[PDB]
């Protein structure tokens, strides 16, 4: 009958629940990039850990190994398209140099306020929540949505949102009536 459904975890808990250094460093990451909870930062840590581990495992191999070649260019390609790796810095010895801040910057929430669409990062988030941003003619409502390089310059207000042309919001309509 029905088969097993595939599920995966995207977060790994820290080995030490209480260390002041880690707690401060993670709270600062929540601060700069407006996040919701520690799971939000552990998710990025986990993705970065996967990337770094894959790079290390490939680098254990010599330069012209078939697997090394294929997987290395694939990984570098994905990172470039996300905008996390430097398009001149095409190597795994250099992909083993990234930080959680690189990934956290490419989030839609950060770009919304970085490009001026919103004042504060919290403003960016509540706009993305209330469906006032669109990407390449698509209303994205996920503050964690990553912005590819191509999508970087094609993000503006929704064509419907009252701040992008549309029926006035509830407050305005109440006042008008």
């Amino acid at each position: 009958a029905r088969l097993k459904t595939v599920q995966s975890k995207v977060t790994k808990s820290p080995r030490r629940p209480f260390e002041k250094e880690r707690l401060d460093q993670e709270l600062k990451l929540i601060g700069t990039f407006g996040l919701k909870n520690k799971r939000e930062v552990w998710r990025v840590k986990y993705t970065l850990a996967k990337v770094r581990k894959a790079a290390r495992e490939l680098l254990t191999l010599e330069d012209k190994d078939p697997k090394r070649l294929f997987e290395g260019n694939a990984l570098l390609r994905r990172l470039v398209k996300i905008g996390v790796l430097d398009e001149t810095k095409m190597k795994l010895d250099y992909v083993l140099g990234l930080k959680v801040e690189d990934f956290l910057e490419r989030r839609l929430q950060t770009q919304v306020f970085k490009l001026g669409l919103a004042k504060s990062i919290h403003h960016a988030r509540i706009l993305i929540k209330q469906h006032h941003i669109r990407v390449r003619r698509q209303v994205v409502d996920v503050p964690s949505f990553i912005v590819r390089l191509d999508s970087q310059k094609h993000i503006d207000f929704s064509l419907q949102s009252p701040y992008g042309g549309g029926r006035p919001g509830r407050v305005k309509r109440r006042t008008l009536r």
């Binding site: 009958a1 029905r2 088969l3 078939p66 070649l69 294929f70």
Partner: protein, 255 residues
């Protein structure tokens, strides 16, 4: 069990059929016939996936009940008919002719052919024997038996079989230097020139084949299918000419 099995779970279906995992619990179970279950394709699947002429499995049956599909010159109305390697499928209404061939990966494709090609097919001589009344016959790998063949035809050879006249036209001999197709194993879908033959007496002989790109590969004789004399193929081949592109070469070609 207590008797023959009539179902075939989707996950148990052959991988090379390339069915989708979440597309129901069952898959069309081919009927017994010319081709083996693992090395065949239901006529229902041919229309459902490879040709897209039918949206669902009621529509496949609706199409096939009209008596519009011919396999090897005979009309087939059963949606579970096991079409297999080097089978001529003719849809007269749309004037379309295909030959069921293997892709380099090892999957069935849609190879459109012309009437001249469709008039014949190749078969591998599986046995040469003498039936009652002392008359010679040869049995192919697709179940066909042909009476009164040329006495020079031996096992493992290829015979050109004319669908219209139901007669043998030519015989290509399984010897070094002839073009050969690989139907089974991990080298399925590859075409090359037969090379050395390791003669294992009580087991399956081993055949080394070198393609046009210079790549060599071995296989078992039961997976080799001669498709021409020297280097000339008696039938056409799908885009690729049985050349196994490497994984890097595939990406480079795509880009």
């Amino acid at each position: 069990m207590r008797g023959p099995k009539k179902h075939l779970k989707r996950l148990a279906a052959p991988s090379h059929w390339m069915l989708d995992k979440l597309g129901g619990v069952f898959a069309v179970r081919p009927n017994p016939g010319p081709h083996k279950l693992r090395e065949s394709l239901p006529l229902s699947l041919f229309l459902r996936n490879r040709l897209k002429y039918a949206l669902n499995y009621t529509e496949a049956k609706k199409i096939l009940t009209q008596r519009v599909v011919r396999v090897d010159g005979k009309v087939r109305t059963c949606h579970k008919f096991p079409t297999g390697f080097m089978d001529v499928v003719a849809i007269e209404r749309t004037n379309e002719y295909f030959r069921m061939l293997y892709d380099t990966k090892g999957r069935y494709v849609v190879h459109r052919i012309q009437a001249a090609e469709a008039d014949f097919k190749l078969c591998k001589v599986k046995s040469v024997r003498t039936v009652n009344k002392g008359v010679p016959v040869l049995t192919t790998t697709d179940g066909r038996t042909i009476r009164y063949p040329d006495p020079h035809v031996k096992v493992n050879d290829t015979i050109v079989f004319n669908i219209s006249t139901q007669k043998i036209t030519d015989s290509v001999k399984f010897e070094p230097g002839n073009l050969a197709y690989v139907t089974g194993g991990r080298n399925v879908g590859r075409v090359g020139i037969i090379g050395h033959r390791e003669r294992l007496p009580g087991a399956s002989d081993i055949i080394h084949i070198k393609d046009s790109a210079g790549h060599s590969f071995a296989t078992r004789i039961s997976n080799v299918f001669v498709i021409g004399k020297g280097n000339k193929a008696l039938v056409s081949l799908p885009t690729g000419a049985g050349i196994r592109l490497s994984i890097a070469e595939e990406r480079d070609k795509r880009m």
